[PDB]
Design a protein around this ligand. Structure first.
Ligand SMILES: COc1cc(NCc2ccc3[nH+]c(N)nc(N)c3c2C)cc(OC)c1OC
Length: 162
């Protein structure tokens, strides 16, 4: 599995559904880390989208309620159903974008950890869960400085090893 969430040093991850800061570059990297692979999102992250569903990519939704409905999307209701669908499609991959409940839902079968740190401080309402970094190892990284110092961030790429 692969994780990917945008959080700032203030332990933030989002705010009012959309993000608290404006990072056009990070918003363009999402389309690059979603096409070709399966995009797994929760119900709060689904409606949080602008013009859903997202085309050019799979749209899965994990929910334990028989009331939520999604037209043109694989509504899964079990962790085995999400992994069972990935087995039939080996050409694609599993990627977690949110919400916080979806991350901890697949935190057990997690492998890669793509975290986007931002130098600019931003306060919101939702925070990121406590990941066990004492069980991972760095392998690659990509630093990038925007026009404003606060708009500075770095894509850290870690890999599980045991
Ligand atoms: C306000 O603009 C937008 C906001 C969001 N919010 C969710 C969001 C934002 C950045 C993200 N960045 C990375 N690295 N990975 C994610 N998983 C991710 C997600 C899940 C998502 C958008 O497209 C889906 C979008 O349009 C650009």
């Amino acid at each position: 599995t692969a994780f990917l969430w945008a959080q700032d040093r203030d332990g933030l991850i989002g705010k009012d559904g959309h993000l608290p800061w404006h990072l056009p570059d990070d918003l363009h990297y999402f389309r690059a880390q979603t096409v070709g692979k399966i995009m797994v999102v929760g119900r709060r992250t689904y409606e949080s989208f602008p013009k859903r569903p997202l085309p050019e990519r799979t749209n899965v939704v994990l929910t334990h309620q028989e009331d939520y409905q999604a037209q043109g999307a694989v509504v899964v209701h079990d962790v085995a159903a999400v992994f069972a669908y990935a087995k039939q499609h080996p050409d694609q991959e599993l990627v977690i974008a949110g919400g916080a409940q979806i991350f901890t839902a697949f935190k057990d079968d997690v492998d890669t950890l793509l975290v986007t740190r931002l130098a600019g401080s931003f306060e919101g309402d939702t925070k990121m869960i406590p990941l066990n970094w004492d069980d991972f190892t760095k392998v690659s990284s990509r630093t990038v400085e925007d026009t404003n110092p606060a708009l500075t961030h770095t894509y850290e790429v870690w890999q599980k090893k045991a």
